[PDB]
Each structure stands twice: as structure tokens, then as C-alpha cells.
Amino acid sequence: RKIRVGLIFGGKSAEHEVSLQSARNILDALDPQRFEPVLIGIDKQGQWHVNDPDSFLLHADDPARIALHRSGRGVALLPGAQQQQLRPIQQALAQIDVVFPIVHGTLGEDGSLQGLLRMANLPFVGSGVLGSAVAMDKDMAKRVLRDARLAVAPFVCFDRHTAAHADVDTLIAQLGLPLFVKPANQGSSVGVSQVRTADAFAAALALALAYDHKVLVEAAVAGREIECAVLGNAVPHASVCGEVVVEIVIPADIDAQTQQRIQQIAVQAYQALGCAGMARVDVFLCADGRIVINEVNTLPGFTRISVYPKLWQASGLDYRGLITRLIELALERHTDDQLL
């Protein structure tokens, strides 16, 4: 009755090395009374490799050099299999009971991996196909958030076939300056430009369009940057808040009343987008102080030093306890999903 926990990690992402460290840390905090790990790493090229727990990493202890051991032990997925759904090309691999996916990159976060795991009838930690796909698409997300009567930065969304037409003056007239230019579909922090003058705009648009088919152009939100951790499925709970300064400060220096209402905004956002298990919600806090949601991230960091587990720590939930709860959440959802 010890449950097998399939950790899937890595990916073609700038955040590849973060996923490595995340997997390392989850491994060390995994309650050994309840869980045995199975290690599946994805290299920067997209190739899947099974590993042994003591030899998944190269230069594990050098963060400038840390790398996946490409063991070349390949993976087969048996679509509609009910048992041993993940199989080795080449002898046998422990039955996996729950997948903890921490694959950064487009496919790991956009509901694509989640669909593959659904197709294999595997319980898995985090948002399902819908919540992942919607939260990842910033344009879709903000539109769902806005409809839920939550505040988002005002914005316009262009594609390739409409960007060619962009009128800068009308944008500046509508949205002001600076303008934040971003791809909708993330892998993000890439293609994000603060355009300060009208002349910078054309180039920001082009850069963003190198990374996605849709690009958002938002007005500036003046206000402090608060991050709030969310956990659970049906009745989500919110961590204490954390403030970003440019350096993260936890617990953020704000009112209990302003904290309480950022917590409720975070929960309402999490529910509008249909998230599960976990999310980090990043908002802006205005002088007003209105609260404007910047981002809902369905795949937060899981290193010891990552903001998400740090926020929960500061809320009286430790790293071990977090991991275990995320696993239980994944199993509860799977068994409710089972019946219907």
C-alpha cells in the first residue's frame, strides 16, 4: 500500500534546470511511509528517460552545471491501458499510482501533458486539461477573469494576421505608456518588453510574435506586486501573501484586511479558470487599493527556495506536508472523475 509516485520532470524550457532542482527536492521530502518514487526525466530535446533515484542527475550539486542523465531508457504510453500505462521500450517499470508532473515548457503546462495523462487513466497532481490550457493562455485567462468581474490590466490582443495593422497612436491613446508587450502563451518571461516610447513598439511586437501566435499589449498597472499560493480542488485555501520588490518578502508588509481580500481574489480567480491542486496567483496592489490580477500560474516552482512552497511554509504548511496534500488532491480528483 505504499503508493508509487511518478515524477515527470525536465523539458524544453529555459526553466529546465528549475524542474531538475524541483524534482530533487520533491524526492527528498517525499514521505517514505507513503510513497516510492519513479523518475521520468525529459531532456531539452523532448526525449523521455527513466532514471534511478540516485542517478537521475549529472553535476547535481553544481547549479551552473546540473543536468539530466539521459539514460536512454525510453517510455511507452499505452493509451486506454488501465494498468502499467507507462511502459519501458526495452524490461519493466513499477506501476505508477499518481503522476506529479513538473514539466516546464509549453507542452508540460498547456494541458497537453495533462491530456496524455488523462488518456492513460493516471491520476496526476495539478490543474486538469481545461484549467491548464486556460491559465496558460493569458489572453483567454484575462477574458475569463474579466467576465468573473475580477480586475485585469486593460489590453489588446493581436495575432500575426492583425499585428501588421497595429496602430500605435490609438494604443497609446487607449492604454497609455509604458505598454507591456507579451506573448499570450508563455514559456514566458521570454518576449516580454516594456515599451517606453512609441518607437520601441514595433520591435516589441515582432519579438513577441517570434514566440507565439498571439501577443498581448497591456496598460501599465502601477502598484505593488503580491504573490499568493493556492491549494486544493473544490475548496481551495490561500497562503499568506508575499511581496515582490525590485527580492521577495514573506510575509508581505500589508494589512490583514488587504491580505484577506487578496486571498479571496486568488481563490475566486483560481475557481473562475477552473484550476486544481495548485496555483500561484500574482496580483498588483494599487494605491487605491484595487487589486488587479497579473497572472495565474498552474505550474509554480518546487525548489526549497521557490516562492510557492515558501508561502505555504510561512502559512504553517511544510514542504513534506505540501507534497503529500498535492498527491491526495490528485487521487481524490481521479476517483471523483472515475464515476462520471
Contact 25, 304 (CB under 8 A): yes
Flag whether 185 is marked binding. no
Residue with cell string 514566458: 188
Residues 6+ apart with CB under 8 A from 211: 183, 185, 187, 190, 191
Flag whether 180 is marked binding. yes
Kindly write out the interface string for residues 195-214 of this chain, putting x where it contacts a second copy by CB under 8 A and - elsewhere.
Answer: ---------------xxxx-
Residue with cell string 497532481: 125
Kindly write out the interface string for residues 87-126 of this chain, putting x where it contacts a second copy by CB under 8 A and - elsewhere.
Answer: x-x-----------------x--xxxxxxx-xx-x-----
* Dist CA 313 CA 244 (whole Å): 17
* Dist CA 121 CA 169 (whole Å): 52
Does position 295 interact with Mg ion (CB under 5 A)? The reply is: yes
Nearer to a second copy, 214 or 310 (CB): 214
Closest CB 67 distance from ligand ANP, rounded Å: 22
Does position 137 interact with Mg ion (CB under 5 A)? The reply is: no
Does position 282 interact with Mg ion (CB under 5 A)? The reply is: yes
Site for a second copy in 40-69 (CB under 8 A): 42, 45-48
Q: Which residues bind ligand ANP (CB under 6 A)?
A: 153, 180, 182, 188-189, 192, 218, 220-221, 225, 294-295
CA atoms within 13 A on the CB side of 23: 36
Closest CB 310 distance from ligand ANP, rounded Å: 15
Nearer to Mg ion, 51 or 106 (CB): 106
Residue with cell string 521520468: 40
Radius of gyration of the chain (CA): 21
Nearer to a second copy, 133 or 323 (CB): 133
41, 48, 79, 88, 103 from 67: Cα distances, Å = 10, 14, 30, 22, 15
Residues 6+ apart with CB under 8 A from 313: 319
Residues 6+ apart with CB under 8 A from 252: 226, 240, 241, 242, 243, 259
Residues at the binding site are 138, 180-182, 188-189, 218-225, 282, 294-295, 297
Residues at the binding site for Mg(2+) are 282, 295, 297
Name the site residues for a second copy (rule: CB under 8 A): 42, 45-48, 74-80, 82, 87, 89, 107, 110-116, 118-119, 121, 129-130, 133-134, 137, 140, 143-144, 146-148, 159, 161, 210-213, 234-235, 274, 336, 340
Residues at the binding site for ADP are 180, 182, 218-219, 221, 225
Residues at the binding site for ATP are 138, 180-182, 188-189, 218-225, 294-295
